[PDB]
Amino acid sequence: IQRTPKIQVYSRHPAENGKSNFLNCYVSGFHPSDIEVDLLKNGERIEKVEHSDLSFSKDWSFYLLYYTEFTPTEKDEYACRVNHVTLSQPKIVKWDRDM
């Protein structure tokens, strides 16, 4: 039995154009643990992205935080792309500054 990830994409602080911040992709509620999580800037994978150590909740589902330092602008679109066995294709979740 497999469980698909919940995905939230968000900033550490409310976004201000030109001010340094962190872009987060928080993946949770999933099983199995094998997962890929990429942050995209205008469709382009960001090279340098770190993540938390693998842990799990009381229902045994896994969770991870992927993050990278960034400066938002009006130009740039950001997204999180999640690749998991429960998904026949990777799911792309766009960043919304008010979610």
Binding site: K6, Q8, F22, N24, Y26, L65, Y67
Partner: peptide
């Protein structure tokens, strides 16, 4: 609701 989520600096967020 959204699930309570880590900010990455040791604090949390929710809305």
């Amino acid at each position: 609701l959204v699930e309570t989520r880590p900010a990455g600096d040791g604090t949390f967020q929710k809305w």
